[PDB]
Amino acid sequence: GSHHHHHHHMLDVVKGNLIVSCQALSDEPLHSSFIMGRMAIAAKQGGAAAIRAQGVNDINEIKEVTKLPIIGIIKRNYDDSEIYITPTMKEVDELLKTDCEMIALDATKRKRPNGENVKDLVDAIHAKGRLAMADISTLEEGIEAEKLGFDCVSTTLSGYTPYSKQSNSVDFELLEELVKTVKIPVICEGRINTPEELKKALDLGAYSAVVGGAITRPQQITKRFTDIL
Amino acid sequence: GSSHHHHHHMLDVVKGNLIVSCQALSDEPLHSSFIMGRMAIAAKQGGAAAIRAQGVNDINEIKEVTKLPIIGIIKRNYDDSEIYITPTMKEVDELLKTDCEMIALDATKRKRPNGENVKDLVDAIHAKGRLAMADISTLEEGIEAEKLGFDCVSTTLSGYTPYSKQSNSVDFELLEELVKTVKIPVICEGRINTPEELKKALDLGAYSAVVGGAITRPQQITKRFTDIL
Numbered sequence A: 001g002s003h004h005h006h007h008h009h010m011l012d013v014v015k016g017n018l019i020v021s022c023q024a025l026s027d028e029p030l031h032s033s034f035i036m037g038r039m040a041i042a043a044k045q046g047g048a049a050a051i052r053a054q055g056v057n058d059i060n061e062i063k064e065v066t067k068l069p070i071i072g073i074i075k076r077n078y079d080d081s082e083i084y085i086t087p088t089m090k091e092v093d094e095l096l097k098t099d100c101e102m103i104a105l106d107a108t109k110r111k112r113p114n115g116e117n118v119k120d121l122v123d124a125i126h127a128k129g130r131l132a133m134a135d136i137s138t139l140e141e142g143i144e145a146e147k148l149g150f151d152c153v154s155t156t157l158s159g160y161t162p163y164s165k166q167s168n169s170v171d172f173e174l175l176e177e178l179v180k181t182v183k184i185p186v187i188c189e190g191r192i193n194t195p196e197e198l199k200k201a202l203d204l205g206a207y208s209a210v211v212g213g214a215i216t217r218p219q220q221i222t223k224r225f226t227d228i229l
Numbered sequence B: 001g002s003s004h005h006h007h008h009h010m011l012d013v014v015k016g017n018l019i020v021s022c023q024a025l026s027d028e029p030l031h032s033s034f035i036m037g038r039m040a041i042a043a044k045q046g047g048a049a050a051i052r053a054q055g056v057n058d059i060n061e062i063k064e065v066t067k068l069p070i071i072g073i074i075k076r077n078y079d080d081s082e083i084y085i086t087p088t089m090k091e092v093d094e095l096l097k098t099d100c101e102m103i104a105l106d107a108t109k110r111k112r113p114n115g116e117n118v119k120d121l122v123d124a125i126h127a128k129g130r131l132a133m134a135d136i137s138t139l140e141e142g143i144e145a146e147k148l149g150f151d152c153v154s155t156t157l158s159g160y161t162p163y164s165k166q167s168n169s170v171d172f173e174l175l176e177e178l179v180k181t182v183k184i185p186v187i188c189e190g191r192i193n194t195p196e197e198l199k200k201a202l203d204l205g206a207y208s209a210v211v212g213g214a215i216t217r218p219q220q221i222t223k224r225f226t227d228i229l
Protein backbone atom coordinates (compact mmCIF):
# COMPACT_ATOMS: atom_id res chain seq x y z
CA GLY A 1 0.00 0.00 0.00
CA SER A 2 0.94 3.66 -0.38
CA HIS A 3 -0.50 7.05 0.57
CA HIS A 4 0.33 10.72 0.23
CA HIS A 5 2.82 12.21 2.68
CA HIS A 6 1.95 14.82 5.34
CA HIS A 7 4.33 17.59 6.45
CA HIS A 8 3.21 17.36 10.13
CA HIS A 9 3.47 14.14 12.12
CA MET A 10 1.86 13.63 15.46
CA LEU A 11 4.88 12.88 17.66
CA ASP A 12 6.82 15.86 16.21
CA VAL A 13 3.75 18.07 16.67
CA VAL A 14 3.26 17.23 20.38
CA LYS A 15 6.98 17.43 21.26
CA GLY A 16 7.48 20.04 23.99
CA ASN A 17 3.76 20.92 23.83
CA LEU A 18 0.55 20.17 25.65
CA ILE A 19 -1.98 17.40 24.89
CA VAL A 20 -5.43 17.94 26.43
CA SER A 21 -7.62 15.04 27.45
CA CYS A 22 -11.31 15.78 26.81
CA GLN A 23 -13.22 12.97 28.52
CA ALA A 24 -16.58 12.71 30.22
CA LEU A 25 -17.89 9.27 31.04
CA SER A 26 -21.58 8.39 31.56
CA ASP A 27 -21.64 9.35 35.24
CA GLU A 28 -20.08 12.80 34.59
CA PRO A 29 -22.01 16.00 33.97
CA LEU A 30 -20.41 16.83 30.56
CA HIS A 31 -21.09 13.39 29.00
CA SER A 32 -21.82 14.35 25.43
CA SER A 33 -19.84 14.29 22.18
CA PHE A 34 -21.17 17.82 21.52
CA ILE A 35 -19.65 19.05 24.73
CA MET A 36 -16.34 17.24 24.29
CA GLY A 37 -16.09 18.78 20.80
CA ARG A 38 -16.46 22.24 22.33
CA MET A 39 -13.93 21.45 25.06
CA ALA A 40 -11.47 20.42 22.36
CA ILE A 41 -12.06 23.69 20.41
CA ALA A 42 -11.35 25.54 23.69
CA ALA A 43 -8.18 23.48 24.18
CA LYS A 44 -7.06 24.14 20.59
CA GLN A 45 -7.69 27.87 21.01
CA GLY A 46 -5.69 27.85 24.27
CA GLY A 47 -2.69 26.27 22.45
CA ALA A 48 -3.14 22.46 22.78
CA ALA A 49 -1.20 20.52 20.15
CA ALA A 50 -3.37 17.38 20.32
CA ILE A 51 -6.39 15.81 22.03
CA ARG A 52 -6.84 12.58 23.95
CA ALA A 53 -10.49 11.39 23.76
CA GLN A 54 -12.58 8.37 24.61
CA GLY A 55 -15.19 6.64 22.52
CA VAL A 56 -15.87 6.64 18.79
CA ASN A 57 -18.60 9.32 18.97
CA ASP A 58 -16.40 11.83 20.90
CA ILE A 59 -13.33 11.10 18.69
CA ASN A 60 -15.31 11.68 15.49
CA GLU A 61 -16.89 14.91 16.80
CA ILE A 62 -13.54 16.27 18.05
CA LYS A 63 -11.83 15.45 14.75
CA GLU A 64 -14.59 17.19 12.76
CA VAL A 65 -14.63 20.35 14.83
CA THR A 66 -10.89 20.76 15.54
CA LYS A 67 -8.82 18.82 12.97
CA LEU A 68 -6.24 18.20 15.75
CA PRO A 69 -4.29 15.01 16.07
CA ILE A 70 -6.09 12.58 18.41
CA ILE A 71 -5.03 9.88 20.85
CA GLY A 72 -8.07 7.66 20.87
CA ILE A 73 -9.12 5.15 23.48
CA ILE A 74 -12.24 3.18 24.43
CA LYS A 75 -12.82 2.53 28.14
CA ARG A 76 -14.81 -0.66 28.70
CA ASN A 77 -15.17 -3.00 31.67
CA TYR A 78 -14.93 -6.74 31.12
CA ASP A 79 -16.00 -9.28 33.75
CA ASP A 80 -12.74 -11.23 33.41
CA SER A 81 -10.11 -8.49 33.61
CA GLU A 82 -9.10 -5.44 35.62
CA ILE A 83 -7.97 -3.70 32.43
CA TYR A 84 -10.40 -1.09 30.99
CA ILE A 85 -8.35 1.22 28.69
CA THR A 86 -8.74 -0.36 25.16
CA PRO A 87 -8.70 -3.87 26.57
CA THR A 88 -9.29 -6.05 23.46
CA MET A 89 -9.12 -6.21 19.64
CA LYS A 90 -12.84 -5.32 19.58
CA GLU A 91 -12.03 -1.82 20.90
CA VAL A 92 -8.96 -1.54 18.65
CA ASP A 93 -11.07 -2.31 15.57
CA GLU A 94 -13.78 0.17 16.70
CA LEU A 95 -11.05 2.85 17.02
CA LEU A 96 -9.56 1.99 13.63
CA LYS A 97 -12.91 3.03 12.07
CA THR A 98 -12.15 6.56 13.27
CA ASP A 99 -9.35 8.80 11.95
CA CYS A 100 -7.44 9.02 15.25
CA GLU A 101 -3.74 8.94 14.47
CA MET A 102 -2.71 7.26 17.73
CA ILE A 103 -4.44 4.62 19.82
CA ALA A 104 -3.58 4.29 23.52
CA LEU A 105 -4.06 1.10 25.46
CA ASP A 106 -3.41 -0.28 28.91
CA ALA A 107 0.01 -2.00 28.69
CA THR A 108 0.08 -3.21 32.25
CA LYS A 109 1.34 -6.69 33.18
CA ARG A 110 -2.24 -7.79 33.80
CA LYS A 111 -4.34 -10.47 32.07
CA ARG A 112 -6.54 -9.08 29.28
CA PRO A 113 -10.12 -10.11 28.52
CA ASN A 114 -10.47 -13.38 26.54
CA GLY A 115 -6.81 -14.07 27.33
CA GLU A 116 -5.78 -11.64 24.54
CA ASN A 117 -2.17 -10.46 24.12
CA VAL A 118 -1.22 -6.81 23.92
CA LYS A 119 1.32 -7.53 21.11
CA ASP A 120 -1.59 -8.51 18.83
CA LEU A 121 -3.29 -5.21 19.56
CA VAL A 122 -0.09 -3.21 18.84
CA ASP A 123 0.41 -5.16 15.59
CA ALA A 124 -3.19 -4.51 14.43
CA ILE A 125 -2.72 -0.80 15.11
CA HIS A 126 0.52 -0.75 13.13
CA ALA A 127 -1.07 -2.81 10.29
CA LYS A 128 -3.30 0.20 9.51
CA GLY A 129 -0.37 2.61 9.85
CA ARG A 130 -1.39 4.18 13.16
CA LEU A 131 0.72 4.85 16.22
CA ALA A 132 0.40 2.95 19.51
CA MET A 133 0.72 4.48 22.99
CA ALA A 134 1.32 2.29 26.03
CA ASP A 135 -0.52 3.48 29.18
CA ILE A 136 1.65 2.09 32.02
CA SER A 137 1.82 2.19 35.81
CA THR A 138 5.39 1.08 36.60
CA LEU A 139 8.94 1.41 35.23
CA GLU A 140 9.10 -2.24 34.27
CA GLU A 141 5.80 -1.90 32.32
CA GLY A 142 7.36 0.96 30.33
CA ILE A 143 10.43 -1.19 29.50
CA GLU A 144 8.30 -4.03 28.29
CA ALA A 145 6.15 -1.60 26.27
CA GLU A 146 9.25 -0.45 24.32
CA LYS A 147 10.21 -4.10 23.72
CA LEU A 148 6.66 -4.73 22.41
CA GLY A 149 7.05 -2.04 19.72
CA PHE A 150 4.91 0.76 21.14
CA ASP A 151 5.64 4.14 19.56
CA CYS A 152 5.54 5.90 22.93
CA VAL A 153 4.68 5.35 26.55
CA SER A 154 2.52 7.33 28.96
CA THR A 155 2.41 7.34 32.78
CA THR A 156 -1.44 7.40 32.70
CA LEU A 157 -2.05 4.40 34.94
CA SER A 158 0.50 5.18 37.70
CA GLY A 159 -1.58 5.31 40.87
CA TYR A 160 -4.48 3.48 39.17
CA THR A 161 -3.14 -0.07 39.63
CA PRO A 162 -2.87 -1.63 43.10
CA TYR A 163 0.89 -2.39 42.85
CA SER A 164 1.94 1.06 41.50
CA LYS A 165 2.75 4.17 43.59
CA GLN A 166 -0.36 5.42 45.38
CA SER A 167 -0.45 9.22 45.23
CA ASN A 168 -2.71 12.21 44.82
CA SER A 169 -0.01 14.08 42.89
CA VAL A 170 2.01 13.73 39.68
CA ASP A 171 4.32 10.73 39.59
CA PHE A 172 7.51 12.57 38.69
CA GLU A 173 9.81 9.75 39.84
CA LEU A 174 8.35 7.30 37.29
CA LEU A 175 8.76 9.98 34.64
CA GLU A 176 12.42 10.56 35.46
CA GLU A 177 13.18 6.86 35.66
CA LEU A 178 11.52 6.15 32.27
CA VAL A 179 13.52 8.98 30.77
CA LYS A 180 16.76 7.36 32.19
CA THR A 181 15.78 4.04 30.62
CA VAL A 182 13.68 3.89 27.43
CA LYS A 183 14.48 5.48 24.07
CA ILE A 184 10.92 6.00 22.83
CA PRO A 185 8.99 9.16 23.79
CA VAL A 186 7.77 9.28 27.38
CA ILE A 187 4.56 11.25 27.92
CA CYS A 188 3.61 12.40 31.40
CA GLU A 189 -0.05 11.89 32.16
CA GLY A 190 -1.77 11.73 35.55
CA ARG A 191 -2.83 14.34 38.09
CA ILE A 192 -1.18 17.35 36.47
CA ASN A 193 -3.14 20.18 38.13
CA THR A 194 -0.93 23.29 37.78
CA PRO A 195 1.19 24.96 35.11
CA GLU A 196 4.15 24.61 37.49
CA GLU A 197 3.66 20.78 37.51
CA LEU A 198 3.45 20.76 33.72
CA LYS A 199 6.66 22.77 33.35
CA LYS A 200 8.35 20.48 35.91
CA ALA A 201 7.32 17.36 33.90
CA LEU A 202 8.85 18.83 30.72
CA ASP A 203 11.94 20.03 32.59
CA LEU A 204 12.38 16.45 33.81
CA GLY A 205 12.47 15.27 30.17
CA ALA A 206 8.92 14.30 29.38
CA TYR A 207 8.59 14.35 25.58
CA SER A 208 5.08 15.80 25.97
CA ALA A 209 2.39 15.84 28.67
CA VAL A 210 -1.36 15.33 28.96
CA VAL A 211 -3.60 17.52 31.13
CA GLY A 212 -7.15 16.31 31.54
CA GLY A 213 -9.52 17.06 34.38
CA ALA A 214 -7.66 20.21 35.48
CA ILE A 215 -8.94 21.74 32.18
CA THR A 216 -11.97 19.66 31.13
CA ARG A 217 -13.61 18.44 34.42
CA PRO A 218 -15.11 21.52 36.05
CA GLN A 219 -16.45 19.33 38.88
CA GLN A 220 -12.90 18.30 39.76
CA ILE A 221 -11.59 21.88 39.40
CA THR A 222 -14.38 23.18 41.59
CA LYS A 223 -13.72 20.55 44.27
CA ARG A 224 -10.07 21.54 44.39
CA PHE A 225 -11.27 25.10 45.18
CA THR A 226 -13.98 24.15 47.75
CA ASP A 227 -11.60 21.69 49.49
CA ILE A 228 -9.31 24.55 50.58
CA LEU A 229 -12.20 26.37 52.45
CA GLY B 1 -48.29 41.54 49.93
CA SER B 2 -46.81 38.25 51.18
CA SER B 3 -45.13 34.93 50.43
CA HIS B 4 -44.19 31.67 52.14
CA HIS B 5 -40.91 31.82 54.06
CA HIS B 6 -37.89 29.79 53.01
CA HIS B 7 -35.37 28.27 55.42
CA HIS B 8 -32.39 29.11 53.20
CA HIS B 9 -31.50 32.60 52.10
CA MET B 10 -28.94 33.38 49.47
CA LEU B 11 -26.52 35.60 51.44
CA ASP B 12 -26.45 33.09 54.32
CA VAL B 13 -25.96 30.18 51.86
CA VAL B 14 -22.93 31.79 50.13
CA LYS B 15 -21.27 33.02 53.38
CA GLY B 16 -17.80 31.46 53.55
CA ASN B 17 -18.51 29.40 50.45
CA LEU B 18 -17.76 29.46 46.72
CA ILE B 19 -19.91 31.02 44.01
CA VAL B 20 -19.12 29.80 40.46
CA SER B 21 -19.63 32.00 37.42
CA CYS B 22 -20.73 29.94 34.41
CA GLN B 23 -20.62 32.23 31.37
CA ALA B 24 -19.84 31.73 27.70
CA LEU B 25 -20.54 34.63 25.40
CA SER B 26 -21.15 34.27 21.64
CA ASP B 27 -17.47 34.32 20.73
CA GLU B 28 -16.58 31.60 23.26
CA PRO B 29 -16.31 27.86 22.64
CA LEU B 30 -18.84 26.69 25.26
CA HIS B 31 -21.57 29.19 24.19
CA SER B 32 -24.84 27.29 24.72
CA SER B 33 -27.45 27.35 27.51
CA PHE B 34 -27.37 23.53 27.53
CA ILE B 35 -23.63 23.57 28.09
CA MET B 36 -23.77 26.24 30.82
CA GLY B 37 -26.42 24.09 32.59
CA ARG B 38 -24.06 21.11 32.51
CA MET B 39 -21.14 23.30 33.75
CA ALA B 40 -23.38 24.51 36.65
CA ILE B 41 -24.25 20.90 37.54
CA ALA B 42 -20.50 20.14 37.63
CA ALA B 43 -19.96 23.19 39.87
CA LYS B 44 -22.80 22.17 42.17
CA GLN B 45 -21.38 18.63 42.46
CA GLY B 46 -17.95 20.10 43.31
CA GLY B 47 -19.51 22.13 46.15
CA ALA B 48 -20.47 25.53 44.71
CA ALA B 49 -23.13 27.24 46.86
CA ALA B 50 -24.48 29.45 44.04
CA ILE B 51 -24.00 30.30 40.36
CA ARG B 52 -23.42 33.61 38.57
CA ALA B 53 -24.81 33.47 35.06
CA GLN B 54 -25.44 35.73 32.06
CA GLY B 55 -28.57 36.00 29.95
CA VAL B 56 -32.14 34.85 30.44
CA ASN B 57 -31.63 31.63 28.47
CA ASP B 58 -28.63 30.46 30.52
CA ILE B 59 -30.16 31.60 33.81
CA ASN B 60 -33.37 29.67 33.11
CA GLU B 61 -31.53 26.48 32.11
CA ILE B 62 -29.16 26.65 35.11
CA LYS B 63 -32.09 27.19 37.45
CA GLU B 64 -34.01 24.27 35.96
CA VAL B 65 -31.13 21.78 36.11
CA THR B 66 -29.41 22.81 39.44
CA LYS B 67 -32.03 24.61 41.59
CA LEU B 68 -29.07 26.63 43.00
CA PRO B 69 -29.28 30.29 44.00
CA ILE B 70 -28.36 32.43 40.99
CA ILE B 71 -26.73 35.87 40.59
CA GLY B 72 -28.11 36.94 37.22
CA ILE B 73 -26.69 39.53 34.85
CA ILE B 74 -27.21 40.58 31.26
CA LYS B 75 -24.16 41.82 29.34
CA ARG B 76 -25.14 44.23 26.55
CA ASN B 77 -23.25 47.00 24.80
CA TYR B 78 -24.86 50.38 24.33
CA ASP B 79 -23.40 52.98 21.97
CA ASP B 80 -23.69 55.78 24.61
CA SER B 81 -21.97 54.11 27.57
CA GLU B 82 -18.92 52.10 28.54
CA ILE B 83 -21.06 50.08 31.01
CA TYR B 84 -22.14 46.59 29.84
CA ILE B 85 -23.01 44.61 33.01
CA THR B 86 -26.81 45.04 33.40
CA PRO B 87 -26.65 48.63 32.19
CA THR B 88 -30.31 49.74 32.07
CA MET B 89 -33.84 49.09 33.36
CA LYS B 90 -34.47 47.09 30.19
CA GLU B 91 -31.98 44.45 31.38
CA VAL B 92 -33.26 44.60 34.98
CA ASP B 93 -36.81 43.86 33.75
CA GLU B 94 -35.63 41.02 31.53
CA LEU B 95 -33.85 39.54 34.55
CA LEU B 96 -36.85 39.95 36.86
CA LYS B 97 -38.86 37.62 34.57
CA THR B 98 -36.36 34.84 35.54
CA ASP B 99 -36.34 33.36 39.03
CA CYS B 100 -32.80 34.59 39.88
CA GLU B 101 -32.63 35.59 43.55
CA MET B 102 -29.90 38.19 43.05
CA ILE B 103 -29.22 40.60 40.17
CA ALA B 104 -25.76 42.04 39.77
CA LEU B 105 -25.11 45.25 37.93
CA ASP B 106 -22.26 47.57 37.11
CA ALA B 107 -22.21 50.07 40.00
CA THR B 108 -19.31 52.17 38.72
CA LYS B 109 -19.28 55.93 38.73
CA ARG B 110 -19.72 55.95 34.95
CA LYS B 111 -22.63 57.34 32.97
CA ARG B 112 -25.22 54.73 31.98
CA PRO B 113 -27.07 54.35 28.71
CA ASN B 114 -29.97 56.79 28.18
CA GLY B 115 -28.63 58.72 31.20
CA GLU B 116 -30.18 56.21 33.64
CA ASN B 117 -28.97 56.05 37.22
CA VAL B 118 -28.00 53.09 39.40
CA LYS B 119 -30.39 54.00 42.24
CA ASP B 120 -33.47 53.49 40.03
CA LEU B 121 -32.19 50.04 39.04
CA VAL B 122 -31.59 49.01 42.71
CA ASP B 123 -35.03 50.28 43.71
CA ALA B 124 -36.74 48.31 40.90
CA ILE B 125 -34.89 45.14 41.94
CA HIS B 126 -35.96 45.68 45.57
CA ALA B 127 -39.56 46.45 44.56
CA LYS B 128 -39.84 42.81 43.35
CA GLY B 129 -38.23 41.42 46.52
CA ARG B 130 -34.88 40.49 44.88
CA LEU B 131 -31.33 41.15 46.07
CA ALA B 132 -28.96 43.60 44.29
CA MET B 133 -25.19 43.12 43.94
CA ALA B 134 -22.94 46.03 43.06
CA ASP B 135 -20.06 45.16 40.72
CA ILE B 136 -17.51 47.87 41.52
CA SER B 137 -13.94 48.79 40.57
CA THR B 138 -12.72 51.13 43.35
CA LEU B 139 -13.06 51.63 47.10
CA GLU B 140 -15.08 54.80 46.50
CA GLU B 141 -17.58 52.97 44.23
CA GLY B 142 -18.05 50.34 46.92
CA ILE B 143 -18.72 52.94 49.60
CA GLU B 144 -21.34 54.62 47.35
CA ALA B 145 -22.89 51.23 46.57
CA GLU B 146 -23.52 50.67 50.28
CA LYS B 147 -25.04 54.18 50.53
CA LEU B 148 -27.37 53.38 47.60
CA GLY B 149 -28.78 50.36 49.48
CA PHE B 150 -27.13 47.50 47.59
CA ASP B 151 -27.35 44.20 49.49
CA CYS B 152 -23.73 43.40 48.73
CA VAL B 153 -20.70 44.61 46.77
CA SER B 154 -18.34 42.64 44.54
CA THR B 155 -14.83 43.53 43.28
CA THR B 156 -15.79 42.26 39.81
CA LEU B 157 -14.76 45.33 37.82
CA SER B 158 -11.44 46.17 39.50
CA GLY B 159 -8.94 46.32 36.64
CA TYR B 160 -11.77 46.52 34.04
CA THR B 161 -12.25 50.29 34.29
CA PRO B 162 -9.46 52.71 33.29
CA TYR B 163 -9.26 54.55 36.65
CA SER B 164 -9.05 51.37 38.76
CA LYS B 165 -5.91 49.35 39.59
CA GLN B 166 -4.57 47.65 36.46
CA SER B 167 -3.52 44.08 37.29
CA ASN B 168 -3.48 40.57 35.94
CA SER B 169 -4.07 39.05 39.40
CA VAL B 170 -6.67 39.30 42.19
CA ASP B 171 -7.03 42.77 43.64
CA PHE B 172 -6.57 41.84 47.31
CA GLU B 173 -5.80 45.50 48.23
CA LEU B 174 -9.30 46.64 47.25
CA LEU B 175 -10.86 43.67 49.07
CA GLU B 176 -9.01 44.54 52.31
CA GLU B 177 -9.91 48.27 52.13
CA LEU B 178 -13.59 47.49 51.45
CA VAL B 179 -13.93 44.96 54.27
CA LYS B 180 -12.61 47.53 56.80
CA THR B 181 -14.92 50.34 55.52
CA VAL B 182 -18.35 48.91 54.43
CA LYS B 183 -20.72 46.90 56.67
CA ILE B 184 -22.55 44.96 53.94
CA PRO B 185 -21.11 41.76 52.50
CA VAL B 186 -18.04 42.21 50.30
CA ILE B 187 -17.58 39.52 47.66
CA CYS B 188 -14.19 38.94 46.04
CA GLU B 189 -14.55 38.50 42.25
CA GLY B 190 -11.93 38.93 39.53
CA ARG B 191 -9.03 36.80 38.38
CA ILE B 192 -9.14 34.18 41.14
CA ASN B 193 -7.04 31.41 39.54
CA THR B 194 -5.94 29.16 42.40
CA PRO B 195 -7.35 27.58 45.54
CA GLU B 196 -4.65 29.40 47.51
CA GLU B 197 -5.95 32.78 46.19
CA LEU B 198 -9.55 31.83 47.11
CA LYS B 199 -8.44 30.94 50.63
CA LYS B 200 -6.53 34.22 50.92
CA ALA B 201 -9.64 36.23 49.84
CA LEU B 202 -11.70 34.58 52.57
CA ASP B 203 -8.86 34.97 55.10
CA LEU B 204 -8.77 38.73 54.31
CA GLY B 205 -12.49 39.02 55.17
CA ALA B 206 -14.30 38.38 51.91
CA TYR B 207 -17.85 37.34 52.83
CA SER B 208 -17.83 34.99 49.83
CA ALA B 209 -16.00 34.86 46.53
CA VAL B 210 -16.69 34.16 42.87
CA VAL B 211 -14.54 31.96 40.62
CA GLY B 212 -15.38 32.00 36.92
CA GLY B 213 -12.97 31.28 34.05
CA ALA B 214 -10.55 29.28 36.22
CA ILE B 215 -13.37 26.67 36.43
CA THR B 216 -15.63 27.31 33.42
CA ARG B 217 -13.41 28.71 30.60
CA PRO B 218 -11.25 25.76 29.46
CA GLN B 219 -9.58 28.00 26.83
CA GLN B 220 -8.31 30.33 29.56
CA ILE B 221 -7.27 27.42 31.77
CA THR B 222 -5.44 25.78 28.86
CA LYS B 223 -3.67 29.07 27.99
CA ARG B 224 -2.32 29.37 31.56
CA PHE B 225 -0.77 25.89 31.07
CA THR B 226 0.59 26.55 27.57
CA ASP B 227 1.93 30.01 28.58
CA ILE B 228 4.42 28.29 30.92
CA LEU B 229 6.01 26.15 28.10
Ligand SMILES: [Cl-]
Pocket: A156
Ligand atom coordinates in the same frame (compact mmCIF):
# COMPACT_ATOMS: atom_id res chain seq x y z
CL1 LIG C 1 -7.40 8.18 30.16
Ligand SMILES: [Cl-]
Pocket: A028, A029, A030, A216, A217, A218, A219, A220, B042
Ligand atom coordinates in the same frame (compact mmCIF):
# COMPACT_ATOMS: atom_id res chain seq x y z
CL1 LIG D 1 -16.82 17.66 35.43
Ligand SMILES: [Cl-]
Pocket: B021, B073, B156
Ligand atom coordinates in the same frame (compact mmCIF):
# COMPACT_ATOMS: atom_id res chain seq x y z
CL1 LIG E 1 -19.27 38.90 35.10
Ligand SMILES: [Cl-]
Pocket: A042, B028, B029, B030, B216, B217, B218, B219, B220
Ligand atom coordinates in the same frame (compact mmCIF):
# COMPACT_ATOMS: atom_id res chain seq x y z
CL1 LIG F 1 -13.46 28.57 27.18
